[PDB]
Symmetry: C2
């Protein structure tokens, strides 16, 4: 309990056996990643992306770290770069996640804005363009960098097995970049090929041949199929309505004091659904990426 840097608090997050009603007398466990010092699972990503960059000789003491982000990655990365005294520029769409931007700046990151209408795609393009005007720079590029899934494969995944009281029937996680799901699933399946890996997507994702539109659930959603899915035997993709996600957000807070983000609600709603189609007395593990407190300005507990 005596620490010297907030970095010591990254990882080793609680695995909570949810005291809720589950179909077929089964059980759902969730990794509470909001307890990371940065408030999200991305604290793990940032640290590893920088370590990987340093290990691959792509980063040096005076290097400028440049990364396109729509949320939590900016915070997690800023935490790690500040630990390494690395200059940081984060490219984020104009009005995306206000609270996250304040945090990104409070941690020392300098922000450059790209048009909201262009989304992450625009941010990615400007990040690359800016990298071209700065000789000593590095773009982690979270959406294509294999170090992304690798970050959870060697940390989060093993932590799950160390706390589980039984074999994992199925792993369930939402996909934004797909790093979390792909990294953990690969490790879990490598340990027990029997473990089912199920990916979750919000309203309006193309991962399940659905229509491409804007969703309420913040954090997840895929434009193009993540390249990381190669190392996983995806047994099923579930699509969750915002209605269900936010209902879970409201229910978990009201009944159990769990303040989870909308993507957490989506992961729980998906886990509950999977429970109805798996053998009884099954053990399902999911991940709660961040808190709801980071979305209070978005009336997350309303309607």
């Amino acid at each position: 309990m005596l620490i010297q840097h907030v970095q010591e608090l990254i990882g080793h997050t609680p695995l909570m056996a949810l005291p809720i009603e589950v179909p077929n007398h089964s059980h759902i466990y969730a990794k509470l990643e909001m307890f990371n010092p940065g408030g999200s699972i991305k604290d793990r990503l940032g640290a590893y992306l920088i370590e990987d960059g340093l290990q691959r000789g792509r980063v040096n003491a005076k290097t400028t770290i440049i990364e396109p982000t729509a949320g939590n990655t900016g915070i997690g990365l800023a935490l790690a770069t500040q630990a390494h005294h690395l200059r940081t520029i984060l490219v984020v769409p104009e009005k995306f996640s206000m609270e996250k931007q304040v945090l990104m700046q409070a941690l020392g990151a300098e922000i450059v804005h790209t048009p909201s209408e262009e989304g992450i795609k625009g941010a990615i393009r400007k990040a690359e363009a800016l990298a071209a005007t700065i000789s000593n720079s590095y773009v982690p590029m979270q959406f294509k960098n294999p170090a992304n899934p690798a970050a959870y494969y060697h940390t989060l995944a093993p932590e799950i097995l160390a706390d589980m009281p039984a074999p994992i029937t199925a792993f369930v996680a939402g996909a934004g970049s797909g790093g979390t799901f792909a990294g953990v699933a690969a490790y879990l399946q490598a340990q027990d090929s029997a473990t089912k890996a199920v990916v979750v997507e919000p309203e309006g994702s193309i991962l399940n041949g659905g229509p491409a539109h804007a969703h309420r659930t913040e954090g997840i959603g895929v434009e193009f199929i993540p390249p990381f899915f190669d190392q996983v035997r995806i047994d099923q993709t579930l699509t969750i309505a915002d209605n269900d996600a936010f209902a879970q957000v409201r229910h978990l807070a009201r009944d159990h004091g769990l303040l989870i983000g909308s993507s957490s609600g989506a992961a729980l709603a998906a886990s509950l659904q999977l429970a109805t189609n798996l053998p009884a007395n099954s053990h399902i593990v999911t991940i709660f990426p961040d808190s709801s407190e980071r979305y209070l300005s978005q009336k997350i507990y309303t309607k």
Copy 2:
């Protein structure tokens, strides 16, 4: 790290040896209470206040808990009442802490508003009146109930000694209700009379013969003399300008990734001040009650 309830995460918070410049080569350690499930040190108080109410035979399964609160206590209490299935009514000034009210309601508490101009004094009066209209009710009354300092005396205080690598030269804490300071100090001093107890207050409090005005530092501040101070040998009272408190908020986040509330900044500023007048190589311990994330809607990192 398998848990079944969020309450298992209350307490046993980290003690951080701040890696910052301290006068006279001394050292400042801070209890990071924002890592409690409810986001603040009040998770400790809520639990204890309800346990104490049950033990004194003042609360039964059907009792309606009614408490006047202008912040985190409402959250910490709602968490505790939830665990015991206790109906909860929180009386809070109209526009006091937007973010905190959302959480209070998300956790199942029913809120009753009192005019903002009346302050906590108004909420207290209404809490007692409401109590008078409900036969089976209980008013913890955090401002007068000795179970308040008791909450920290038996948990937080011992936790500090268990992590301290050396004897505590001075203990520093901000006083709102005075519970945290009085409870911890009384325990530390009981263990070692040599330990100095120092109270901190935002500019505009009576604790130091100062005037009476509103301050930017949220969560702390004294109207009348807290009754809890009788169990402490207060060695000094420090008044901190808002400019100093918020400076520390900005600095700790920018340099160390520590997202702290304004009252935390005031406590660090006081601790740094104390360091300049204590022998060299001294060991100072203080408390960081909550995070800054809970004040993003108030431009806590601005100006």
